[PDB]
Amino acid sequence: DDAAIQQTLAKMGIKSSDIQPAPVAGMKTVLTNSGVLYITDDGKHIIQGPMYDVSGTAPVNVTNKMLLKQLNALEKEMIVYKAPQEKHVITVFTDITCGYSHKLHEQMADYNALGITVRYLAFPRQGLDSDAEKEMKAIWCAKDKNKAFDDVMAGKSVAPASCDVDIADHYALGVQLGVSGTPAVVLSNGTLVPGYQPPKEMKEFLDEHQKMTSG
Amino acid sequence: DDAAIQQTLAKMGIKSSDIQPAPVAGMKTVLTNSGVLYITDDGKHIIQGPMYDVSGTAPVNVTNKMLLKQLNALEKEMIVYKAPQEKHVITVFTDITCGYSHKLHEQMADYNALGITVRYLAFPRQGLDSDAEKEMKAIWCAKDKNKAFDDVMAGKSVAPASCDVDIADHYALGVQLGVSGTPAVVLSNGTLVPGYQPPKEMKEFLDEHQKMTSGK
């Protein structure tokens, strides 16, 4: 029961963020300061994720699917480049100091034109004590985030700006989702697709992924 | 049901090596080329792991246990150089083409004199089919494995063989244990200590480690 899980977590000096159900009988999904963990109902066993549902045609990352709750929770903190005819919606962990992230951003109008809406979350590859984290902190805190992001990528004046957006939250989520390098795309089902793909290749990928997921 | 589990693994291009009931009801501990995975009896869900038994004072790594199980099965294939008076027993992943493995073997008398029993398993850094793997296969397939390893490390040839020994097994397990180079030392509890240490340093290290693990 919950008391057992809490006693086990407390023993390990872990602070439970919330106890959710798991697709496996006998255990729960637990998001903690240490991240997501699976723990048996009796609190006797812990299994580090991720957990995958492999009953279907393709493997689904259930941990990531669950984390989409935390991801969608950051929706207002995302820098969104809306496609006029939104046919696809992807969330991309980006680093303004990454050459490939610049290459992707430079073609944003093409992704948008192909019907792909891009939502950015910050991911400083160099960690929280880096120029990347400071620069993106200022971007996300700007009156106009899109303008600020476009400017910084173009190598312009990154106006000093502060707010309560914590890049550490974006970074932690990305790490938990399995983000290693940038850019990294997160799909609507939680699937992580690390890497850069030009507008055309990307569109086809998104079209095929979708076709081979719903049936 | 191992059956449904193997169908799931196959559809993922993953191969199983050993399947055992897990400490968690409705789950099994599966050793695969992708590491130790925890899969449900119906083969529908896979959890990466490791799994830890936290129903005690300190966490117990179930994955480490599964790996030690494989190591125990390999004891019958280890080349053992026993110390007259056995104070320590270490398992060493060695490569006959490795300069530090040459040195370690050349100092075997000293490790043994210092009470250290050394048990070898093969680990071709250059992978399977390499010249290293081929020669060790010949060594491990010989009547007297000790004499054959000695002869080879001495530059002499050994009566080749086609036995039941497959170096791929040692290699695969080494990889699963975290071995990346040679020589690599594996302690009784599964702790991997990569690298060469001369006899005296190795002895001090093992004594200190044993003291620390026993709280003395």
Side-chain angles (χ1 to χ4, degrees):
Chain A
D1 65 323
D2 287 349
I5 290 170
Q6 288 305 306
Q7 293 181 312
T8 290
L9 293 174
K11 283 165 53 176
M12 307 176 295
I14 302 178
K15 50 183 180 179
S16 176
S17 182
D18 180 58
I19 298 180
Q20 285 303 304
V24 178
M27 58 179 62
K28 295 291 170 293
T29 298
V30 195
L31 173 61
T32 71
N33 49 297
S34 302
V36 176
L37 298 181
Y38 292 89
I39 188 174
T40 53
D41 296 317
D42 53 27
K44 292 170 60 177
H45 297 87
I46 291 176
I47 316 173
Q48 292 194 298
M51 175 192 278
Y52 302 82
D53 175 319
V54 295
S55 68
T57 299
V60 170
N61 194 323
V62 311
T63 300
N64 277 23
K65 187 182 185 67
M66 167 68 78
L67 286 168
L68 288 175
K69 185 178 182 182
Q70 295 293 300
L71 176 155
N72 291 320
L74 298 178
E75 217 159 71
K76 307 300 185 183
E77 274 170 54
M78 296 174 178
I79 297 185
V80 187
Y81 290 91
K82 180 76 165 187
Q85 309 298 304
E86 176 172 291
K87 305 175 179 182
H88 288 296
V89 175
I90 64 175
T91 304
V92 178
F93 283 85
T94 188
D95 183 338
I96 62 88
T97 64
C98 165
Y100 274 111
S101 285
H102 178 97
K103 191 151 290 181
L104 182 162
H105 195 63
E106 182 165 48
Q107 310 174 78
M108 186 58 78
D110 290 316
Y111 288 107
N112 290 167
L114 302 183
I116 303 167
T117 284
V118 180
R119 310 187 306 174
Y120 290 135
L121 282 180
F123 194 89
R125 295 165 298 158
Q126 289 290 93
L128 299 180
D129 288 302
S130 65
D131 301 321
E133 189 272 355
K134 294 186 179 60
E135 291 296 291
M136 298 202 272
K137 176 77 168 62
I139 289 172
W140 262 261
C141 286
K143 185 72 177 182
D144 192 322
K145 297 178 298 186
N146 298 68
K147 193 271 193 175
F149 189 98
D150 298 341
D151 282 355
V152 173
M153 278 295 221
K156 295 190 178 65
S157 306
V158 49
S162 184
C163 69
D164 301 308
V165 168
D166 201 322
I167 300 303
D169 294 326
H170 299 198
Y171 184 70
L173 176 60
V175 170
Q176 299 172 178
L177 293 171
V179 170
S180 46
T182 58
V185 183
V186 181
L187 310 177
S188 69
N189 69 328
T191 297
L192 180 68
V193 181
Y196 160 73
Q197 299 172 54
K200 291 169 60 181
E201 289 65 30
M202 182 70 87
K203 177 50 165 47
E204 259 58 7
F205 173 75
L206 297 178
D207 290 330
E208 285 304 305
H209 166 73
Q210 176 165 163
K211 295 181 180 183
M212 294 187 268
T213 297
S214 185
Chain B
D1 170 38
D2 299 333
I5 296 175
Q6 296 183 179
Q7 304 294 177
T8 289
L9 296 177
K11 294 300 167 291
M12 297 182 81
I14 298 177
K15 196 177 189 64
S16 179
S17 186
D18 183 29
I19 303 175
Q20 295 298 309
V24 177
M27 292 197 80
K28 310 202 78 164
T29 300
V30 184
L31 173 59
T32 77
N33 58 296
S34 299
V36 176
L37 305 173
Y38 296 98
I39 312 176
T40 52
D41 295 345
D42 57 29
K44 296 190 198 296
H45 298 83
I46 293 177
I47 310 172
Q48 292 269 304
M51 174 189 285
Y52 300 81
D53 177 321
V54 287
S55 74
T57 58
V60 180
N61 192 322
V62 174
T63 288
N64 175 60
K65 188 166 185 173
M66 181 61 149
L67 292 179
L68 289 174
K69 176 174 180 288
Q70 313 299 308
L71 199 62
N72 174 264
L74 284 180
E75 291 184 302
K76 64 180 173 295
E77 286 179 26
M78 297 177 179
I79 303 178
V80 183
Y81 290 84
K82 186 182 169 301
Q85 295 98 208
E86 190 164 279
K87 304 302 180 181
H88 297 291
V89 179
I90 56 180
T91 300
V92 178
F93 280 96
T94 187
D95 181 339
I96 51 178
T97 65
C98 177
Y100 280 113
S101 288
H102 298 156
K103 197 189 181 200
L104 190 163
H105 197 64
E106 287 180 30
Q107 298 176 303
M108 190 58 72
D110 298 309
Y111 289 112
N112 287 171
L114 292 180
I116 301 164
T117 286
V118 178
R119 317 191 300 185
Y120 295 136
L121 279 181
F123 191 94
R125 293 168 298 161
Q126 295 161 294
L128 304 181
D129 303 309
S130 65
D131 316 308
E133 184 265 317
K134 293 200 182 70
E135 190 75 54
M136 294 197 277
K137 175 71 161 61
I139 290 173
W140 259 263
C141 273
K143 168 190 60 181
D144 190 314
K145 296 179 293 176
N146 293 69
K147 207 285 192 179
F149 195 96
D150 290 352
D151 292 337
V152 169
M153 289 299 232
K156 299 200 304 178
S157 183
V158 60
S162 177
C163 71
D164 68 58
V165 174
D166 193 347
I167 298 303
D169 290 325
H170 303 190
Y171 185 58
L173 180 59
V175 174
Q176 299 286 185
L177 292 167
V179 178
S180 48
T182 57
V185 184
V186 176
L187 309 178
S188 299
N189 60 16
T191 302
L192 177 64
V193 180
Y196 158 84
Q197 298 182 56
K200 296 179 182 65
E201 290 87 330
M202 185 68 83
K203 180 51 163 56
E204 181 198 13
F205 172 77
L206 294 173
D207 287 340
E208 289 307 312
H209 174 85
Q210 179 165 288
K211 289 176 179 180
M212 299 183 271
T213 66
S214 65
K216 301 303 173 188

